[PDB]
């Protein structure tokens, strides 16, 4: 019990992600090394992207966050 694993996200998608694929995104901890946001796509997916790029920055202004 309790100290469970995290999501982290060890590498990013490098070529940005069509809105249109997407539903959602959630960050991920805050303890984890890489600072990185997770975009659920439609299809199901879970893409970790990086936070700083501006194409990440849109979607996470366009798409709602969603709660695990």
Do not use: E, N
């Not at 982290?8 to 809105?19: A, I, M, N, S």
């Not at 893409?47 to 501006?54: I, Q």
């Amino acid at each position: 019990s309790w100290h469970r694993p995290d999501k982290c996200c060890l590498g990013y998608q490098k070529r940005p992600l069509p809105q249109v694929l997407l539903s959602s995104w959630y960050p991920t901890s805050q303890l984890c090394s890489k600072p990185g946001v997770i975009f659920l796509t439609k299809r199901g997916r879970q893409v970790c992207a990086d936070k700083s790029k501006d194409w990440v920055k849109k979607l996470m202004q366009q798409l709602p966050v969603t709660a695990r």
